Symmetry: D2
């Protein structure tokens, strides 16, 4: 059991706060490309958190999956999921969804792996700013979100997973992955609890 | 659940040499259910011995992971706020020692970590790169923890992951199975040890 | 005094080993132009590198180019760009930041963008090279006492044998150029002129 | 050229502060193995800095070069510099010099490459503590110090190179490397200046 071995202990929240919005891009919001399930409701709920973040003067990062136009950086990930390779810089599918369009000062991290931390400058970007707790929204819960939450935690940041701002293709994976995160990696709670508990 | 197929997840990852083996966190603490064991870990340990012995006889690069924190908790992290038992895993605590069944021999790297992935804040990527490893077989514990973290990173780091499905262990079966699904769909070739050894 | 190096066993030979690759670091219009960030022996280094790039292309060698790029709104403005404020003007579409027409990239050659000195720091270079199984990496670019050196020490650290093309790295100032080659020869890389490198 | 192209701009100092001492270990204190030049003097001066940091409550981290007993992690670095191999965990040459012995709470970072950040948890450890400016001491100026300094900057930290607390086996490399760092990568100043200003 998790309870028996001391898992899922609370992870106290601590300022300064920042927000990471992972991979909320056109391709992931379209159920015919990489979207589906509860991903779109998650986008909508993130709108509230993003506006709170901006008002509160928190650091905000967005990630995007972007591969080179010649497929020169086509990788292991793009063998497992071929479609990832079609997320080119200027392709509509790879652009941030219009509901969550980045404002000035917000860092757009481009990646070709699931984590927004891997082979990117995100850790360094957040450390420069002294960020202590990173709120996380995005898609998918059992993909880039999970991987970005493990890395945030490993990079020394306290992850607050916004359970209603993370969306997945399929609810079993979504639930199975929230569970892991609550047990091993993160504070996990709804956006309105997060927003309340963070001022 | 049909969206995985429609959207083109779960494509086959062709195995490619040179091969290497990573054994994640099969330490006495994770073999003993009073501490971090239970579920199907013990069986994953046993089967892993065959993979280890094949690795040695085939001249494969072998690496092993250990969780280790400092004796004064000086590296106490976010990971150990969430799972405070992790902090007991000290360098010379029996609990942090690789299970005897799978003791390393000469040439086999042991990677000490304080996070879930064997790649994070360690030399593993660099160690494999220098050896030209193309496909990394993975065994270890726990499927829904350090095995999955190491597999997503292995892949990210440019290595082809091959999860030995009967050589990775968890303390609970639902998490074990749910994380196998995800890995098979997004990150690894997944097969039993005998398929894996036959095909390398 | 420098006799200590030979006594303590510095500067041993780094045997070369295929597969080979080529990194050209930051040979961009702003480092070529002596009115912006160039000068020294950088113009000469750029041209000599052409022969290496062509030879890399004849031999089918993995090839990677680096560029310093910050966000248009200074979103990713950092510590490096406080110390050297003009790097912050290296934007994606600023001609200063573009690769020099002499060395324009081709299909399959990787353009890594960075906001730090090393082509490896916070980029996917290590994993791009790993995937391709690269053992030895030839390095060219500017500046020798800057991004070149940072990139060479990283390459080494990541598991690759660096081969610093002494006549294909340039600096805006020659004293730093010569000091950093010395360091690199003593500790971090095989160091030779390009005719020598291409002959092996 | 550095002047006309905007190099060497001041790097303002910002709390919280941390201190990293790099590879001040017996092998590097010993002129017969890896020591010499002005290293012995850097170690003694560092005593002053470490005492201050402990008193002021700062995060303090010490790095060490450590390869496996069986050479399993023998690497490219260990090819150019084969003596780095000989620094096993329990070889007295890898141990931190006694004058700078760690206390409880101070992180000992083990590395098999130049930089204290590379393939280590040093960035995460400092990030979790919200360190903004990292004071740096150690050996060798033109080796592991510089490699750590450049990484510290890259990782988001403001590096403060302590010019009388970093040593090398040769004064040329030491001065060249201090020059590079001041121009591109850090605030450089003597421990007297650093301590009063922090």
């Amino acid at each position: 059991s998790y309870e028996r071995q001391g898992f899922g202990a609370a992870l106290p929240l601590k300022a300064p706060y920042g927000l990471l919005i992972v991979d909320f891009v056109n391709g992931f919001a379209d159920p015919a490309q990489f979207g589906g399930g509860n991903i779109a409701a998650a986008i909508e709920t993130t709108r509230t958190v993003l506006a709170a973040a901006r008002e509160r003067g928190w650091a905000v990062a967005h990630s995007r999956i972007v591969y080179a136009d010649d497929d020169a950086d086509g990788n292991i990930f793009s063998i497992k999921v071929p479609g990832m390779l079609t997320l080119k810089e200027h392709a509509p599918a790879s652009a941030i969804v219009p509901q969550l369009a980045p404002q000035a000062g917000e860092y757009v991290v481009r990646k070709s792996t699931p984590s927004a931390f891997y082979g990117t400058m995100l850790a360094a970007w957040l450390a420069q700013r002294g960020v202590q707790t990173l709120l996380v929204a995005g898609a998918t819960t059992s993909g880039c979100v999970r991987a970005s939450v493990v890395d945030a935690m490993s990079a020394g940041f306290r992850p607050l997973v916004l359970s209603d701002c993370v969306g997945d293709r399929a609810l079993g994976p979504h639930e199975a992955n929230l569970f892991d995160m609550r047990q091993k990696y993160a504070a996990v709670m709804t956006h309105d609890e997060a927003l309340a508990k963070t001022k």
